Write a protein that binds this ligand. Structure first.
Ligand code: NA
Ligand code: NA
Length: 158
């Protein structure tokens, strides 16, 4: 009833490779809120701005018991380098095979260059403590975004 997106059951058990060398799963986050933000490419201007914006709000997400995950299809090593350079204190998922991206339907097509071109569309989601996707943002405008996500989280967590 309150879900805005339905994920295949298997999505929650996908092994998600993280920066730092461990794996997580969405089911492993049961019991707390999870923010999942998808971005197209490590170490580019918009993606760096977005990551820094979430990083600055980490104590506010903590106040709510929430965790954050950033997601792109860059490698674990790329993610480690991005986290170290920028000082990120949350993990990045290396979704190299785009399994998580496809589950959230963030791989979008554009007719460009006389081709059908597929790529990650910047998108964010709020996953409840019981694993429901209760809010989505697609074609994300980076400016103001992390603040808006935090506000929405607070409103939902009540
Ligand atoms: Na970087
Ligand atoms: Na969760």
């Amino acid at each position: 009833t309150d879900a805005v997106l339905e994920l295949p059951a298997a999505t929650f058990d996908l092994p998600l490779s993280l920066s730092g060398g461990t794996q997580t799963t969405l089911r492993a986050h049961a019991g707390h809120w999870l923010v999942i933000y998808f971005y197209p490419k490590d170490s580019t201007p918009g993606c760096t701005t977005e990551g820094l914006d979430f990083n600055a709000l980490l104590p506010e997400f903590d106040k709510a018991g929430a965790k954050i995950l950033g997601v792109s299809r860059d490698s674990v090593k790329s993610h480690d380098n991005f986290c170290a350079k920028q000082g990120f204190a949350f993990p990045l998922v290396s979704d190299g095979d785009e399994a998580l991206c496809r589950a959230f339907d963030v791989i979008k097509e554009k007719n460009m260059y006389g081709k059908q071109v597929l790529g990650i569309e910047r998108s964010t989601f709020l996953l409840s403590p019981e694993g429901q996707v209760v809010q989505a943002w697609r074609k994300v405008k980076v400016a103001g975004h992390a603040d808006a996500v935090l506000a929405a989280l607070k409103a939902h967590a009540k």
